[PDB]
Write a protein that binds this ligand. Structure first.
Ligand SMILES: CC(=O)N[C@@H]1[C@@H](O)[C@H](O[C@@H]2O[C@H](CO)[C@H](O)[C@H](O)[C@H]2O)[C@@H](CO)O[C@@H]1O
Ligand code: CA
Length: 498
Protein backbone atom coordinates (compact mmCIF):
# COMPACT_ATOMS: atom_id res chain seq x y z
CA UNK A 1 0.00 0.00 0.00
CA UNK A 2 1.12 3.66 -0.44
CA UNK A 3 2.21 5.25 2.88
CA UNK A 4 -0.13 6.17 5.72
CA UNK A 5 -0.28 9.88 6.56
CA UNK A 6 -0.91 11.22 10.10
CA UNK A 7 -1.47 14.98 9.76
CA UNK A 8 -1.49 16.77 13.15
CA UNK A 9 -2.66 20.41 13.44
CA UNK A 10 -2.46 22.36 16.71
CA UNK A 11 -4.55 25.53 17.23
CA UNK A 12 -3.04 29.01 17.95
CA UNK A 13 0.39 27.48 18.73
CA UNK A 14 3.28 30.01 18.26
CA UNK A 15 6.53 29.56 16.28
CA UNK A 16 8.77 28.62 19.29
CA UNK A 17 6.22 26.71 21.52
CA UNK A 18 7.76 23.22 20.67
CA UNK A 19 10.89 22.05 22.52
CA UNK A 20 12.52 21.47 19.10
CA UNK A 21 11.84 25.19 18.19
CA UNK A 22 13.48 26.43 21.46
CA UNK A 23 10.60 26.06 24.01
CA UNK A 24 10.66 25.55 27.79
CA UNK A 25 7.44 23.53 27.11
CA UNK A 26 8.39 19.79 27.17
CA UNK A 27 7.24 18.15 23.88
CA UNK A 28 9.35 14.94 23.84
CA UNK A 29 7.06 12.94 21.45
CA UNK A 30 6.83 15.75 18.80
CA UNK A 31 10.59 16.49 19.30
CA UNK A 32 11.33 12.76 18.54
CA UNK A 33 9.39 13.15 15.21
CA UNK A 34 11.65 16.21 14.50
CA UNK A 35 14.85 14.27 15.50
CA UNK A 36 13.85 11.38 13.16
CA UNK A 37 12.64 13.75 10.42
CA UNK A 38 12.89 17.36 9.23
CA UNK A 39 11.81 20.74 10.64
CA UNK A 40 11.00 23.70 8.33
CA UNK A 41 12.12 27.23 9.39
CA UNK A 42 10.05 29.24 6.80
CA UNK A 43 6.62 27.49 6.77
CA UNK A 44 3.73 30.03 6.89
CA UNK A 45 -0.02 29.72 7.52
CA UNK A 46 -2.85 32.26 6.90
CA UNK A 47 -2.82 33.96 10.35
CA UNK A 48 -6.36 32.71 11.42
CA UNK A 49 -8.20 29.37 12.15
CA UNK A 50 -10.90 29.12 9.45
CA UNK A 51 -8.77 30.45 6.52
CA UNK A 52 -5.84 28.13 7.50
CA UNK A 53 -8.19 25.10 7.77
CA UNK A 54 -9.84 25.92 4.39
CA UNK A 55 -6.37 26.30 2.75
CA UNK A 56 -5.06 23.08 4.40
CA UNK A 57 -8.12 21.04 3.31
CA UNK A 58 -8.33 22.37 -0.31
CA UNK A 59 -4.70 23.29 -1.23
CA UNK A 60 -6.19 26.67 -2.35
CA UNK A 61 -6.00 30.19 -0.90
CA UNK A 62 -8.73 30.71 1.72
CA UNK A 63 -10.97 33.09 -0.32
CA UNK A 64 -10.96 30.75 -3.38
CA UNK A 65 -12.40 28.04 -1.01
CA UNK A 66 -15.10 30.54 0.30
CA UNK A 67 -13.40 31.17 3.68
CA UNK A 68 -11.98 34.70 3.37
CA UNK A 69 -12.93 35.40 7.03
CA UNK A 70 -14.60 32.98 9.53
CA UNK A 71 -17.49 30.51 10.07
CA UNK A 72 -19.12 33.20 12.32
CA UNK A 73 -21.06 34.62 9.30
CA UNK A 74 -21.88 33.89 5.65
CA UNK A 75 -21.45 37.32 3.90
CA UNK A 76 -23.29 35.96 0.78
CA UNK A 77 -20.54 37.37 -1.50
CA UNK A 78 -17.72 35.67 -3.45
CA UNK A 79 -14.77 34.79 -1.13
CA UNK A 80 -16.69 35.15 2.19
CA UNK A 81 -19.27 32.33 2.57
CA UNK A 82 -18.23 31.34 6.15
CA UNK A 83 -17.87 27.75 4.78
CA UNK A 84 -15.65 25.64 2.44
CA UNK A 85 -17.11 25.33 -1.11
CA UNK A 86 -18.37 21.99 -2.54
CA UNK A 87 -16.58 23.07 -5.80
CA UNK A 88 -12.99 22.15 -4.68
CA UNK A 89 -12.30 18.67 -3.23
CA UNK A 90 -10.84 18.34 0.29
CA UNK A 91 -7.64 16.38 1.06
CA UNK A 92 -9.98 13.66 2.52
CA UNK A 93 -11.91 13.43 -0.82
CA UNK A 94 -8.55 13.31 -2.75
CA UNK A 95 -7.10 10.56 -0.51
CA UNK A 96 -10.41 8.57 -0.56
CA UNK A 97 -10.45 8.71 -4.43
CA UNK A 98 -6.95 7.00 -4.26
CA UNK A 99 -8.16 4.13 -1.96
CA UNK A 100 -7.29 5.69 1.45
CA UNK A 101 -9.41 5.14 4.58
CA UNK A 102 -10.00 8.70 5.90
CA UNK A 103 -10.29 9.59 9.62
CA UNK A 104 -10.56 12.93 11.45
CA UNK A 105 -10.46 13.73 15.19
CA UNK A 106 -11.04 17.25 16.61
CA UNK A 107 -11.77 20.83 15.48
CA UNK A 108 -13.39 21.40 12.00
CA UNK A 109 -14.21 25.18 11.94
CA UNK A 110 -15.05 25.33 8.19
CA UNK A 111 -18.87 24.77 8.56
CA UNK A 112 -20.92 28.00 8.90
CA UNK A 113 -21.87 28.53 12.61
CA UNK A 114 -25.60 28.68 11.70
CA UNK A 115 -25.45 25.02 10.41
CA UNK A 116 -24.40 23.39 13.77
CA UNK A 117 -27.75 21.56 14.39
CA UNK A 118 -28.06 19.57 11.11
CA UNK A 119 -25.57 18.42 8.44
CA UNK A 120 -25.70 20.90 5.49
CA UNK A 121 -23.20 19.13 3.11
CA UNK A 122 -20.01 20.70 4.66
CA UNK A 123 -19.63 18.36 7.71
CA UNK A 124 -16.39 16.29 7.90
CA UNK A 125 -18.20 12.99 7.11
CA UNK A 126 -19.86 14.70 4.04
CA UNK A 127 -16.47 16.10 2.78
CA UNK A 128 -14.44 12.88 2.44
CA UNK A 129 -13.95 11.52 6.03
CA UNK A 130 -15.07 7.88 6.63
CA UNK A 131 -14.85 8.57 10.39
CA UNK A 132 -15.12 11.83 12.34
CA UNK A 133 -15.10 12.57 16.07
CA UNK A 134 -14.91 16.17 17.32
CA UNK A 135 -16.51 19.59 17.75
CA UNK A 136 -17.46 21.55 14.58
CA UNK A 137 -17.02 24.87 16.50
CA UNK A 138 -13.85 27.03 16.54
CA UNK A 139 -14.46 28.07 20.18
CA UNK A 140 -15.80 26.88 23.54
CA UNK A 141 -14.54 25.00 26.60
CA UNK A 142 -12.41 21.80 26.92
CA UNK A 143 -15.07 20.37 29.34
CA UNK A 144 -18.17 20.69 27.08
CA UNK A 145 -17.46 21.52 23.45
CA UNK A 146 -20.54 22.03 21.24
CA UNK A 147 -21.55 20.74 18.84
CA UNK A 148 -19.74 17.35 19.07
CA UNK A 149 -20.48 14.88 16.25
CA UNK A 150 -19.60 11.23 15.72
CA UNK A 151 -19.83 11.26 11.87
CA UNK A 152 -23.34 12.85 11.46
CA UNK A 153 -24.64 11.83 14.97
CA UNK A 154 -24.91 14.65 17.52
CA UNK A 155 -23.31 13.72 20.91
CA UNK A 156 -25.14 15.56 23.78
CA UNK A 157 -23.83 13.54 26.79
CA UNK A 158 -20.21 13.58 28.07
CA UNK A 159 -18.45 11.40 30.70
CA UNK A 160 -17.78 13.33 33.98
CA UNK A 161 -13.92 13.51 33.47
CA UNK A 162 -14.26 14.64 29.77
CA UNK A 163 -11.32 16.75 28.47
CA UNK A 164 -11.53 17.64 24.73
CA UNK A 165 -7.74 17.06 24.06
CA UNK A 166 -7.98 13.56 25.66
CA UNK A 167 -11.14 12.74 23.61
CA UNK A 168 -9.37 13.86 20.37
CA UNK A 169 -6.32 11.64 21.16
CA UNK A 170 -8.54 8.68 22.30
CA UNK A 171 -10.74 8.89 19.15
CA UNK A 172 -7.60 9.03 16.89
CA UNK A 173 -6.04 6.05 18.79
CA UNK A 174 -9.41 4.13 18.37
CA UNK A 175 -9.47 4.88 14.60
CA UNK A 176 -5.91 3.51 14.19
CA UNK A 177 -6.71 0.41 16.35
CA UNK A 178 -9.76 -0.41 14.09
CA UNK A 179 -7.85 0.42 10.83
CA UNK A 180 -7.50 -2.54 8.41
CA UNK A 181 -3.69 -2.62 7.79
CA UNK A 182 -4.18 -3.88 4.15
CA UNK A 183 -5.49 -0.33 3.33
CA UNK A 184 -3.61 3.01 3.39
CA UNK A 185 -4.80 5.43 6.15
CA UNK A 186 -5.20 9.25 5.99
CA UNK A 187 -5.67 10.54 9.54
CA UNK A 188 -6.22 14.24 10.37
CA UNK A 189 -5.77 15.09 14.08
CA UNK A 190 -7.02 18.65 14.58
CA UNK A 191 -6.15 19.44 18.23
CA UNK A 192 -7.94 22.33 20.01
CA UNK A 193 -4.89 23.00 22.25
CA UNK A 194 -3.52 25.50 22.91
CA UNK A 195 -6.67 27.49 21.89
CA UNK A 196 -8.43 29.42 24.71
CA UNK A 197 -9.75 29.05 27.28
CA UNK A 198 -6.77 28.08 29.50
CA UNK A 199 -8.02 24.71 30.88
CA UNK A 200 -5.95 21.65 31.88
CA UNK A 201 -5.98 19.08 34.71
CA UNK A 202 -4.41 20.67 37.85
CA UNK A 203 -1.57 18.03 38.12
CA UNK A 204 -0.32 18.92 34.58
CA UNK A 205 -0.54 22.71 35.38
CA UNK A 206 1.43 22.20 38.65
CA UNK A 207 4.00 20.09 36.68
CA UNK A 208 4.64 23.24 34.48
CA UNK A 209 4.28 26.06 37.11
CA UNK A 210 7.85 26.24 38.58
CA UNK A 211 9.72 27.11 35.29
CA UNK A 212 7.33 30.12 34.69
CA UNK A 213 8.15 31.78 38.11
CA UNK A 214 11.15 33.59 36.41
CA UNK A 215 8.71 35.54 34.15
CA UNK A 216 8.38 36.06 30.39
CA UNK A 217 11.49 38.30 29.93
CA UNK A 218 13.93 35.58 31.15
CA UNK A 219 11.98 32.79 29.33
CA UNK A 220 11.69 34.79 26.06
CA UNK A 221 15.44 35.59 25.87
CA UNK A 222 16.13 31.89 26.68
CA UNK A 223 13.85 30.82 23.77
CA UNK A 224 15.70 33.32 21.49
CA UNK A 225 19.09 31.90 22.59
CA UNK A 226 17.83 28.28 21.96
CA UNK A 227 16.60 29.38 18.47
CA UNK A 228 20.26 30.46 17.76
CA UNK A 229 21.74 27.18 19.23
CA UNK A 230 19.21 25.17 17.10
CA UNK A 231 20.25 27.20 13.92
CA UNK A 232 16.81 28.82 13.26
CA UNK A 233 18.39 32.32 13.57
CA UNK A 234 21.95 33.55 12.72
CA UNK A 235 24.30 34.08 15.70
CA UNK A 236 24.59 37.87 14.94
CA UNK A 237 20.81 38.70 15.21
CA UNK A 238 19.82 41.09 18.06
CA UNK A 239 17.09 40.01 20.53
CA UNK A 240 13.99 41.91 19.31
CA UNK A 241 11.88 43.72 21.98
CA UNK A 242 8.61 44.83 20.26
CA UNK A 243 7.17 48.18 21.48
CA UNK A 244 4.76 49.09 18.59
CA UNK A 245 2.22 46.35 19.49
CA UNK A 246 2.25 47.52 23.19
CA UNK A 247 1.72 51.23 22.16
CA UNK A 248 5.38 52.01 23.13
CA UNK A 249 4.79 50.76 26.73
CA UNK A 250 5.74 47.01 26.70
CA UNK A 251 5.70 46.11 30.43
CA UNK A 252 8.94 44.45 31.67
CA UNK A 253 8.35 41.53 34.13
CA UNK A 254 9.48 43.74 37.13
CA UNK A 255 6.69 46.34 36.21
CA UNK A 256 3.81 43.89 36.95
CA UNK A 257 2.26 43.72 40.45
CA UNK A 258 2.61 40.48 42.45
CA UNK A 259 -1.05 39.64 41.59
CA UNK A 260 -0.38 40.22 37.82
CA UNK A 261 2.85 38.05 37.96
CA UNK A 262 1.01 35.20 39.83
CA UNK A 263 -1.83 35.33 37.22
CA UNK A 264 0.68 35.34 34.27
CA UNK A 265 2.51 32.31 35.84
CA UNK A 266 -0.76 30.32 36.29
CA UNK A 267 -1.97 31.26 32.75
CA UNK A 268 1.34 30.35 30.98
CA UNK A 269 1.76 27.16 33.08
CA UNK A 270 -1.78 26.17 32.00
CA UNK A 271 -0.95 26.99 28.33
CA UNK A 272 2.25 24.83 28.64
CA UNK A 273 0.23 21.95 30.26
CA UNK A 274 -2.34 22.09 27.40
CA UNK A 275 0.53 21.54 24.87
CA UNK A 276 2.29 18.90 27.03
CA UNK A 277 -1.04 16.86 27.09
CA UNK A 278 -1.24 17.06 23.24
CA UNK A 279 2.39 15.86 23.16
CA UNK A 280 1.53 12.91 25.52
CA UNK A 281 -1.37 12.12 23.14
CA UNK A 282 1.00 12.18 20.10
CA UNK A 283 3.12 9.63 22.06
CA UNK A 284 0.02 7.40 22.43
CA UNK A 285 -0.83 7.70 18.71
CA UNK A 286 2.79 6.80 17.68
CA UNK A 287 2.67 3.80 20.11
CA UNK A 288 -0.60 2.62 18.44
CA UNK A 289 0.90 2.95 14.89
CA UNK A 290 3.85 0.77 16.10
CA UNK A 291 1.52 -1.88 17.71
CA UNK A 292 -0.47 -2.07 14.42
CA UNK A 293 2.80 -2.75 12.44
CA UNK A 294 2.20 0.51 10.46
CA UNK A 295 5.21 2.62 11.53
CA UNK A 296 7.65 1.79 8.68
CA UNK A 297 4.97 2.78 6.08
CA UNK A 298 3.71 5.96 7.91
CA UNK A 299 4.56 9.67 7.43
CA UNK A 300 3.82 12.11 10.30
CA UNK A 301 3.26 15.85 9.69
CA UNK A 302 2.89 18.44 12.53
CA UNK A 303 2.05 22.18 12.25
CA UNK A 304 -0.04 25.06 13.77
CA UNK A 305 -3.00 26.80 12.04
CA UNK A 306 -1.84 30.33 13.12
CA UNK A 307 0.45 32.11 15.58
CA UNK A 308 -0.27 32.72 19.28
CA UNK A 309 -3.19 35.08 20.14
CA UNK A 310 -3.56 38.19 22.36
CA UNK A 311 -7.37 37.53 22.43
CA UNK A 312 -7.06 36.50 26.14
CA UNK A 313 -6.27 40.13 27.20
CA UNK A 314 -3.29 42.10 28.54
CA UNK A 315 -1.41 39.15 30.16
CA UNK A 316 -2.44 37.02 27.15
CA UNK A 317 -0.53 39.45 24.86
CA UNK A 318 2.63 38.82 26.96
CA UNK A 319 2.04 35.01 26.70
CA UNK A 320 1.73 35.47 22.86
CA UNK A 321 4.95 37.66 22.79
CA UNK A 322 6.77 34.70 24.40
CA UNK A 323 5.05 32.02 22.22
CA UNK A 324 5.68 33.82 18.88
CA UNK A 325 9.43 34.41 19.61
CA UNK A 326 11.28 35.68 17.65
CA UNK A 327 8.43 37.23 15.58
CA UNK A 328 6.18 40.34 16.03
CA UNK A 329 2.40 40.56 16.37
CA UNK A 330 -0.21 37.83 16.70
CA UNK A 331 -3.05 35.72 15.34
CA UNK A 332 -5.43 37.65 12.97
CA UNK A 333 -2.74 39.77 11.22
CA UNK A 334 -0.25 38.87 8.50
CA UNK A 335 3.05 39.73 10.27
CA UNK A 336 5.52 36.92 11.04
CA UNK A 337 4.06 36.29 14.55
CA UNK A 338 0.57 35.49 13.21
CA UNK A 339 1.73 33.44 10.14
CA UNK A 340 4.96 31.54 11.18
CA UNK A 341 4.46 27.91 12.32
CA UNK A 342 6.65 24.94 13.20
CA UNK A 343 6.38 22.29 10.43
CA UNK A 344 7.70 18.72 10.93
CA UNK A 345 7.64 15.87 8.34
CA UNK A 346 8.84 12.51 9.76
CA UNK A 347 8.92 9.09 8.05
CA UNK A 348 8.44 6.17 10.48
CA UNK A 349 11.05 4.33 8.34
CA UNK A 350 14.36 5.91 9.56
CA UNK A 351 15.98 5.34 6.07
CA UNK A 352 13.28 7.47 4.31
CA UNK A 353 14.40 10.57 6.35
CA UNK A 354 17.10 12.05 4.03
CA UNK A 355 17.72 15.20 6.23
CA UNK A 356 17.43 13.40 9.64
CA UNK A 357 17.37 15.96 12.53
CA UNK A 358 18.01 18.93 10.13
CA UNK A 359 16.21 22.21 9.21
CA UNK A 360 14.81 22.60 5.64
CA UNK A 361 14.83 26.34 4.68
CA UNK A 362 12.38 25.99 1.71
CA UNK A 363 9.81 28.83 1.98
CA UNK A 364 6.39 27.18 2.23
CA UNK A 365 2.70 27.81 2.96
CA UNK A 366 -0.22 25.70 4.31
CA UNK A 367 -1.50 25.44 0.66
CA UNK A 368 1.53 23.06 0.22
CA UNK A 369 0.04 20.36 2.53
CA UNK A 370 -2.30 18.83 -0.08
CA UNK A 371 0.23 18.53 -2.99
CA UNK A 372 2.84 17.19 -0.44
CA UNK A 373 0.28 14.50 0.74
CA UNK A 374 -0.54 13.69 -2.94
CA UNK A 375 3.25 13.22 -3.66
CA UNK A 376 3.63 10.95 -0.53
CA UNK A 377 0.66 8.86 -1.82
CA UNK A 378 1.47 9.12 -5.59
CA UNK A 379 -2.23 10.17 -5.62
CA UNK A 380 -4.18 11.47 -8.69
CA UNK A 381 -6.63 14.42 -8.34
CA UNK A 382 -10.28 13.25 -8.68
CA UNK A 383 -11.02 13.20 -12.48
CA UNK A 384 -14.29 15.25 -12.13
CA UNK A 385 -12.24 18.39 -11.07
CA UNK A 386 -9.53 20.33 -12.97
CA UNK A 387 -6.27 20.23 -10.92
CA UNK A 388 -5.24 23.91 -10.40
CA UNK A 389 -3.42 23.64 -7.03
CA UNK A 390 -1.31 26.77 -6.42
CA UNK A 391 1.04 25.11 -3.88
CA UNK A 392 4.07 22.81 -4.22
CA UNK A 393 5.09 19.32 -2.94
CA UNK A 394 7.64 19.88 -0.17
CA UNK A 395 9.14 16.36 -0.81
CA UNK A 396 11.85 17.43 -3.37
CA UNK A 397 13.81 19.82 -1.08
CA UNK A 398 13.89 17.22 1.78
CA UNK A 399 15.15 14.61 -0.76
CA UNK A 400 18.13 16.81 -1.78
CA UNK A 401 16.58 18.93 -4.64
CA UNK A 402 17.34 22.70 -4.71
CA UNK A 403 15.11 25.20 -2.81
CA UNK A 404 12.64 26.94 -5.20
CA UNK A 405 11.72 30.63 -5.02
CA UNK A 406 8.13 31.24 -3.81
CA UNK A 407 5.48 33.95 -4.10
CA UNK A 408 3.06 33.60 -1.15
CA UNK A 409 -0.09 35.65 -0.44
CA UNK A 410 -1.86 36.65 2.80
CA UNK A 411 -5.02 38.58 3.74
CA UNK A 412 -7.05 38.71 6.96
CA UNK A 413 -9.40 41.56 8.08
CA UNK A 414 -7.57 43.94 5.61
CA UNK A 415 -4.16 42.92 7.05
CA UNK A 416 -2.35 42.03 3.77
CA UNK A 417 1.02 40.52 2.80
CA UNK A 418 2.93 39.19 -0.20
CA UNK A 419 6.24 37.29 0.26
CA UNK A 420 8.07 37.36 -3.11
CA UNK A 421 11.60 35.86 -3.02
CA UNK A 422 13.32 37.55 -0.01
CA UNK A 423 10.85 40.53 0.00
CA UNK A 424 7.77 40.92 2.19
CA UNK A 425 5.25 43.71 1.57
CA UNK A 426 2.92 43.83 4.62
CA UNK A 427 0.26 46.10 6.24
CA UNK A 428 -1.52 45.68 9.59
CA UNK A 429 -4.85 46.87 8.06
CA UNK A 430 -6.17 49.18 5.31
CA UNK A 431 -5.70 52.05 7.90
CA UNK A 432 -1.88 51.37 7.99
CA UNK A 433 0.65 51.92 5.15
CA UNK A 434 2.47 49.07 3.33
CA UNK A 435 5.83 48.23 4.99
CA UNK A 436 8.63 46.68 2.83
CA UNK A 437 10.76 44.08 4.69
CA UNK A 438 13.92 42.36 3.40
CA UNK A 439 13.33 38.96 5.09
CA UNK A 440 16.94 37.81 4.23
CA UNK A 441 18.47 40.58 6.46
CA UNK A 442 15.43 41.58 8.61
CA UNK A 443 13.33 38.44 9.30
CA UNK A 444 11.80 40.13 12.45
CA UNK A 445 10.16 42.91 10.29
CA UNK A 446 11.97 45.77 12.18
CA UNK A 447 13.10 48.07 9.26
CA UNK A 448 10.59 49.46 6.73
CA UNK A 449 12.44 50.06 3.38
CA UNK A 450 9.30 51.33 1.52
CA UNK A 451 10.77 54.93 1.21
CA UNK A 452 14.00 53.44 -0.24
CA UNK A 453 12.29 51.20 -2.91
CA UNK A 454 9.06 52.92 -4.10
CA UNK A 455 9.11 51.08 -7.53
CA UNK A 456 9.33 47.66 -5.80
CA UNK A 457 6.52 48.65 -3.33
CA UNK A 458 4.38 49.42 -6.45
CA UNK A 459 5.32 46.11 -8.19
CA UNK A 460 4.62 43.94 -5.07
CA UNK A 461 1.40 45.88 -4.37
CA UNK A 462 0.29 45.20 -8.00
CA UNK A 463 1.11 41.46 -7.63
CA UNK A 464 -0.94 41.32 -4.38
CA UNK A 465 -3.91 43.20 -5.95
CA UNK A 466 -3.91 40.82 -9.01
CA UNK A 467 -3.92 37.74 -6.70
CA UNK A 468 -6.62 39.34 -4.47
CA UNK A 469 -8.94 40.19 -7.39
CA UNK A 470 -8.51 36.67 -8.92
CA UNK A 471 -9.22 34.95 -5.49
CA UNK A 472 -12.42 37.01 -4.60
CA UNK A 473 -10.60 38.79 -1.74
CA UNK A 474 -12.37 42.13 -2.61
CA UNK A 475 -13.99 44.08 -1.18
CA UNK A 476 -11.82 44.04 1.96
CA UNK A 477 -13.68 44.09 5.32
CA UNK A 478 -12.30 45.13 8.77
CA UNK A 479 -15.42 45.73 10.97
CA UNK A 480 -14.56 44.22 14.41
CA UNK A 481 -16.04 40.75 15.30
CA UNK A 482 -19.48 41.65 16.81
CA UNK A 483 -20.19 44.65 14.49
CA UNK A 484 -19.20 42.55 11.42
CA UNK A 485 -21.44 39.58 12.36
CA UNK A 486 -24.42 41.92 13.07
CA UNK A 487 -23.93 43.79 9.73
CA UNK A 488 -23.99 40.58 7.64
CA UNK A 489 -26.79 38.94 9.75
CA UNK A 490 -28.82 42.14 8.95
CA UNK A 491 -27.92 41.94 5.21
CA UNK A 492 -28.87 38.22 5.05
CA UNK A 493 -29.79 36.22 8.21
CA UNK A 494 -29.77 32.93 6.18
CA UNK A 495 -26.83 31.17 7.96
CA UNK A 496 -27.80 27.66 6.72
CA UNK A 497 -24.71 27.32 4.41
CA UNK A 498 -26.93 25.45 1.85
C1 LIG B 1 -18.56 36.32 22.29
C2 LIG B 1 -17.69 37.05 21.32
O1 LIG B 1 -18.15 37.88 20.54
N1 LIG B 1 -16.38 36.77 21.38
C3 LIG B 1 -15.44 37.00 20.30
C4 LIG B 1 -14.60 35.76 20.00
O2 LIG B 1 -15.47 34.69 19.61
C5 LIG B 1 -13.58 36.03 18.91
O3 LIG B 1 -12.62 34.96 18.85
C6 LIG B 1 -12.77 33.99 17.83
O4 LIG B 1 -13.80 33.11 18.27
C7 LIG B 1 -14.08 32.01 17.40
C8 LIG B 1 -15.33 31.33 17.93
O5 LIG B 1 -15.69 30.16 17.18
C9 LIG B 1 -12.86 31.12 17.41
O6 LIG B 1 -12.63 30.66 18.76
C10 LIG B 1 -11.66 31.90 16.92
O7 LIG B 1 -10.51 31.13 17.13
C11 LIG B 1 -11.44 33.26 17.61
O8 LIG B 1 -10.50 34.07 16.85
C12 LIG B 1 -12.77 37.30 19.17
C13 LIG B 1 -11.97 37.72 17.94
O9 LIG B 1 -11.00 38.70 18.25
O10 LIG B 1 -13.62 38.42 19.50
C14 LIG B 1 -14.51 38.18 20.59
O11 LIG B 1 -13.80 37.89 21.75
CA1 CA C 1 -6.24 28.72 15.36
Amino acid sequence: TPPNIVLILCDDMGFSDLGCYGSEIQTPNIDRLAENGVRFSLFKNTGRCCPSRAALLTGHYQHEAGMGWMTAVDEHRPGYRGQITKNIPTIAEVMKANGYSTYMSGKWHVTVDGAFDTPNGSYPAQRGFDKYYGCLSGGGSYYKPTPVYSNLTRIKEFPDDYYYTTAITDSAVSFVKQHPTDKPMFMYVAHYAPHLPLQAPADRVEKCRDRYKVGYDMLRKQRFDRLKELKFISDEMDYPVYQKEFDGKRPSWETLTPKQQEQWITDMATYAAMIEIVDSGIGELVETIKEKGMLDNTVFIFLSDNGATKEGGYLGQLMADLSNTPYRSYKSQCFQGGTSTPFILSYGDAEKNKMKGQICRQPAHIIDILPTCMDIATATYPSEFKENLPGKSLLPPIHGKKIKPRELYFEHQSSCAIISNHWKLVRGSRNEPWELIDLSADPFETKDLSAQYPKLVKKLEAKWNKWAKQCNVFPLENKPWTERINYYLKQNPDQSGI
